[PDB]
Amino acid sequence: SEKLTFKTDLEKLEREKAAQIGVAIVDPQGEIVAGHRMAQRFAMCSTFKFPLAALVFERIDSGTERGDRKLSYGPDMIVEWSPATERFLASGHMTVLEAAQAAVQLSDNGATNLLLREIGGPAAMTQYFRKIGDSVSRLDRKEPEMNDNTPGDLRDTTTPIAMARTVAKVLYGGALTSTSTHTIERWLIGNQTGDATLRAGFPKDWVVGEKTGTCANGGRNDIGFFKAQERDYAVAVYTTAPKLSAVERDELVASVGQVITQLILSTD
Ligand SMILES: *C(=O)[C@@H]([C@@H]1NC(C(=O)O)=C(S[C@@H]2CN[C@H](C(=O)Nc3cccc(C(=O)O)c3)C2)[C@@H]1C)[C@@H](C)O
Numbered sequence: 001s002e003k004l005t006f007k008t009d010l011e012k013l014e015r016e017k018a019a020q021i022g023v024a025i026v027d028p029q030g031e032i033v034a035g036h037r038m039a040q041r042f043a044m045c046s047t048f049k050f051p052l053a054a055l056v057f058e059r060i061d062s063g064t065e066r067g068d069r070k071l072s073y074g075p076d077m078i079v080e081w082s083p084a085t086e087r088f089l090a091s092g093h094m095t096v097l098e099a100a101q102a103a104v105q106l107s108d109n110g111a112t113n114l115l116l117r118e119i120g121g122p123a124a125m126t127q128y129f130r131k132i133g134d135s136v137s138r139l140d141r142k143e144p145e146m147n148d149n150t151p152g153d154l155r156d157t158t159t160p161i162a163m164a165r166t167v168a169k170v171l172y173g174g175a176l177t178s179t180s181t182h183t184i185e186r187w188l189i190g191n192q193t194g195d196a197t198l199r200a201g202f203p204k205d206w207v208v209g210e211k212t213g214t215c216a217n218g219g220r221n222d223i224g225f226f227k228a229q230e231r232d233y234a235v236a237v238y239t240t241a242p243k244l245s246a247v248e249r250d251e252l253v254a255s256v257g258q259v260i261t262q263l264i265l266s267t268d
């Protein structure tokens with residue numbers, strides 16, 4: 001059983017690394033392919049920036065937002081890890097699209113907060129989840145507090161299965177226009193922060209796009225999609241490994257990528 005090997009290999013990682021690993025892989029329609037702790041809640045941390053960008057694109061598609069609109073800000077908007085926001089600070093603004101791309105591809109926190117305000121805050125982000133059929137994911141705070149990952153806290157959480165299904169809805173389920181879907185796909189492929197995580201564990205001929213997250217108390221996450229030949233999948237990986245170093249957490253997520261690969265390659 002290839003899925004039994006998948007489960008056993010994840011459990012070996014959990015045991016050896018003192019970690020918890022939540023995984024869901026779904027097909028484009030949200031049907032479950034495989035998972036582990038699929039419905040356990042984990043902090044989203046920076047992975048929510050992908051759904052945030054989808055919300056922004058939904059508004060651009062609708063006409064309630066414009067991609068080129070200039071969002072003015074001052075130094076008050078700069079928070080820890082805001083590389084693009086810092087560079088654009090002197091100019092005085094970033095456009096909606098510039099900010100969204102920085103949030104997705106650099107995990108820029110200042111850019112994330114800039115957008116959060118424009119779309120209606122954590123309440124509005126949560127309403128977007130509900131709109132697209134995700135009754136589970138919730139945003140309660142902005143940057144940086146949403147990354148606290150206090151044990152047991154249900155604020156700012158999702159589950160692997162809820163998030164994988166949200167990814168599939170956005171990329172394959174018609175949530176966005178064809179143009180906006182293509183753009184957000186390319187942004188995920190071109191992400192600058194995920195070279196050592198999930199995609200490091202996937203075959204080099206698979207098309208992979210993802211959004212990473214790192215939060216306190218040992219959280220390391222990676223969500224997105226992969227295309228293995230003609231077959232498209234959505235995937236969400238959330239891990240908690242308090243006793244690993246940062247490099248080791250990256251390697252853990254890459255290891256999960258290899259376990260996913262072994263399953264996908266053995267089931268075709
Ligand atoms: C979201 O969880 C969190 C911020 N996001 C991430 C993250 O994982 O996304 C981080 S951590 C850090 C900031 N940018 C990092 C990076 O160095 N990317 C990268 C690029 C090239 C090579 C490597 C490597 O292997 O060394 C890493 C990832 C950030 C805490 C919050 C703040 O929003």
Ligand SMILES: [Ca+2]
Pocket residue numbers: 073074075076077
């Ligand atoms: Ca200011």
